[PDB]
């Protein structure tokens, strides 16, 4: 249920 | 957090959620302590009995949020960990003593109106506010309850119980970097830490200096919320000496 | 420094909505 976080986090 | 209420929106600014990266999914709480500096419990990181064992690239550090699951755009700051500390005596083999662990961060974090550092109390900070029917404040995004899930951070006040009947309420070895913290079934409030809160802070604010200090660290229970039962958290001020060797390097 | 000191609430004058529940218990 966690949004996806950007990519630039990995 | 089980009995507590939402939080308001940038009412705990050191609040800090530790997030594994594959599952996603929450790992712990923690505490922003410095730009670079992030306060947990140890065994968020290591805990042998169900064999967590987490290394810096395992984990991200995510800071001024408040929506559980939602990335925070504009807000929330994500932040990668150059290196761990675990209390080098930290007991996970029977009572927890010692749970606590620093994370430095690669990159300084920007503080903003939802991100901003708790102080660590001092010697006359911990005599002062830790006395028994003192009340301090626990955040997290536990368990709503023992036996689902919050939308938002959550908030408790709790009292600091008596040092005899933290004792007398479990067949567990209690020590001196240990205090235990909620209400006795005579007082009828309720509230508790819960799993997932692990690693939050238990902060009071200075009737001195109107400043929030971190006194604990979310450490263990048994269950949650229960009747006679109290949530027990890491005596911060016990193992600032720790603290201060770990960030002095 | 300014630790412990919330840009919304203490910076501001602002009370939260339970912060006095802790200042009543510090008798
Ligand atoms: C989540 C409730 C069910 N789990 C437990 O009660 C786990 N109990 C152990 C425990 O709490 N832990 C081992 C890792 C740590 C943990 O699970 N912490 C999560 C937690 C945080 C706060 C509370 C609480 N204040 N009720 C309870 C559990 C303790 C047992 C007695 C000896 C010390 C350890
Ligand atoms: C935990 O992980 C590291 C590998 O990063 C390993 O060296 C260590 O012995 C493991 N177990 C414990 C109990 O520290
Ligand atoms: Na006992
Ligand atoms: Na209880």
Not at chain 2, 71 to 84: C, D, H, P, T, V
Not at chain 2, 122 to 133: K, V
Not at chain 2, 158 to 167: A, D, F, Q
Not at chain 2, 203 to 221: A, D, E, L, T
Request: charged share 30%.
């Amino acid at each position: 249920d966690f949004e996806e976080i950007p990519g630039e986090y990995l | 957090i089980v009995e507590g209420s939402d939080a308001e929106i940038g009412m705990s600014p050191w609040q800090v959620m530790l997030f594994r990266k594959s599952p996603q999914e929450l790992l712990c709480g923690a505490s922003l302590i410095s730009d670079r500096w992030v306060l947990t419990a140890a065994h968020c990181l290591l805990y042998p009995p169900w064999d967590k064992n987490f290394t810096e690239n395992d984990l991200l550090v995510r800071i001024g949020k408040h929506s559980r699951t939602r990335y925070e755009r504009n807000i929330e700051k994500i932040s990668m960990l150059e290196k761990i500390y675990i209390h080098p005596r930290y007991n996970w083999r029977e009572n927890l003593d010692r749970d606590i662990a620093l994370m430095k961060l690669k990159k300084p974090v920007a503080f903003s109106d939802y991100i901003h550092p708790v102080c660590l109390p001092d010697r006359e900070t911990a005599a002062s506010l830790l006395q028994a029917g003192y009340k301090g404040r626990v955040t997290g995004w536990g368990n709503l309850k023992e036996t689902g899930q919050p939308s938002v951070l959550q908030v408790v006040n709790l009292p600091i119980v008596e040092r005899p009947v933290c004792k007398d309420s479990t067949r567990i070895r209690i020590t001196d970097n240990m205090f235990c913290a909620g209400y006795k079934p005579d007082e009828g409030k309720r509230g508790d830490a819960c799993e997932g809160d692990s690693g939050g802070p238990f902060v009071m604010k200075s009737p001195f200096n109107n400043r929030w200090y971190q006194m604990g660290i979310v450490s263990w229970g048994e269950g949650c919320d229960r009747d006679g039962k109290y949530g027990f958290y890491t005596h911060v001020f016990r193992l600032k000496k720790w603290i201060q060797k770990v960030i002095d390097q | 420094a300014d630790c412990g000191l919330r840009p919304l609430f203490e910076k501001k004058s602002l009370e939260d909505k339970t912060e006095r529940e802790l200042l009543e218990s510090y008798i």
